[PDB]
Amino acid sequence: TCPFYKKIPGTGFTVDAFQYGVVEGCTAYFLTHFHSDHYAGLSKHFTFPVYCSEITGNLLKNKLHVQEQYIHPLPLDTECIVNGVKVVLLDANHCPGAVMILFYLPNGTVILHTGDFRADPSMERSLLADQKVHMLYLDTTYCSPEYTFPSQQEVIRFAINTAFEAVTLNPHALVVCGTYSIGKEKVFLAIADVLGSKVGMSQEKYKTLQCLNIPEINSLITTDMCSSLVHLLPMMQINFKGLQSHLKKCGGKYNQILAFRPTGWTHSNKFTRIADVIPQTKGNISIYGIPYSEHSSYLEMKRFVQWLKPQKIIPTVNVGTWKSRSTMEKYFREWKLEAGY
Ligand code: NI
């Protein structure tokens, strides 16, 4: 059945709740972003109103074939009325089209649902600054102090410099980047820009990227693999066996692969700086795991919450075990005592 942390009190609304069948009492289903654990259940047979960003609504129409009459895209940073309730969509700094949702309840309560987000100080100057938030539905993916990672800018600088050096030393090297969902497009697009190449990919993945309103995208991507020296493949194929096989398909154009796996966190972070990252190598294949995150680090999360000062926090991630739930609640209390709210 639908868990309580997917329901918005005082409304008929749910958030990211498409896999439970007809939720009793639900008049509007919101979708924060186009990732499968959140959209699970949607299809061309869905006949209730879906509220989302313009980019998410492009993906629902083109990839899942949801009918247009049930897609209700909303502009960002704009007060809108849905079934008699004022709502605002804010940029979540996650993947393309991802939003946070502010709900202004008829009784005066204000609720923020972060969806999935990477907290940033720029959020402290949005429409959130303008009123008090009483309840926070929080993406707690990395809510423990072991989770540190570098800025997205530091990670992309590492990736660009590594790829440029490799291909300048060997003009017959191929760069490969893994993917299994939308997000992290900066990784492959920044590398193709430094090399003077388009990114080559499958027709299915090209279709998906063409839904994202990214500027000048026709200039950066292609389905012609032959004309490209940066290839995108499924994340599952980013291993020695999968890469050796791909290199065979390129007909002797290339004699070396340099591959990137943009993971979330991995425990090489507790010790290793970005400067000190090294690949796994076999023969003429090297694989780099880079810590490019689209979720908050522990410290980024803690700064946002201590700024916002909510009266009540409802976690939406890591809620399935008692030890995780109790640990998170202990951090929330530390934060509140340290900041004085
Ligand atoms: Ni996500």
Please indicate, yes or no, whether residues 288 and 308 belong to a single structural domain of this protein.
Answer: no
Please indicate, yes or no, whether residues 195 and 303 belong to a single structural domain of this protein.
Answer: no
Please indicate, yes or no, whether residues 177 and 132 belong to a single structural domain of this protein.
Answer: no
Please indicate, yes or no, whether residues 132 and 189 belong to a single structural domain of this protein.
Answer: no
Q: Give the residue ranges of DSSP H helices in 170-226.
A: 185-195, 203-210
Task: State whether residue 311 is helix, strand or coil.
Answer: coil
What approach was used to elucidate this structure? X-ray
Please indicate, yes or no, whether residues 32 and 91 belong to a single structural domain of this protein.
Answer: yes
- Token pair in block for residue 170: 């060997």
Please indicate, yes or no, whether residues 184 and 103 belong to a single structural domain of this protein.
Answer: no
33 Cα–ligand 1 center, Å: 7
268 Cα–ligand 1 center, Å: 23
- Strand ranges (DSSP E) for 105-186? 110-113, 135-138, 173-179
Q: Counting beta carbons within 10 angstroms of the beta carbon of residue 5, is it exposed (0 to 12), middle (13 to 18) or buried (19 or more)?
A: middle
Please indicate, yes or no, whether residues 141 and 251 belong to a single structural domain of this protein.
Answer: no
162 contact partners, CB below 8 Å, separation of at least 6: 258, 288
Please indicate, yes or no, whether residues 90 and 202 belong to a single structural domain of this protein.
Answer: no
Q: How far is CA 300 from the centre of its chain?
A: 16
233 Cα–ligand 1 center, Å: 20
Range of the domain at 31: 1-147+296-341
* Count of domains for the chain: 2
b/e burial code for range 280-307 (CB count within 10 A of at least 16 → b):
eeeeebbbbbbbbbbbbbbebbbbbbee
Declared resolution, Å: 1.5
256 Cα–ligand 1 center, Å: 33
341 Cα–ligand 1 center, Å: 30
165 Cα–ligand 1 center, Å: 32
14 Cα–ligand 1 center, Å: 17
Please indicate, yes or no, whether residues 250 and 265 belong to a single structural domain of this protein.
Answer: yes
- Tell me how far CA of residue 254 lies from CA of 176, 226, 281, in angstroms: 12, 11, 17
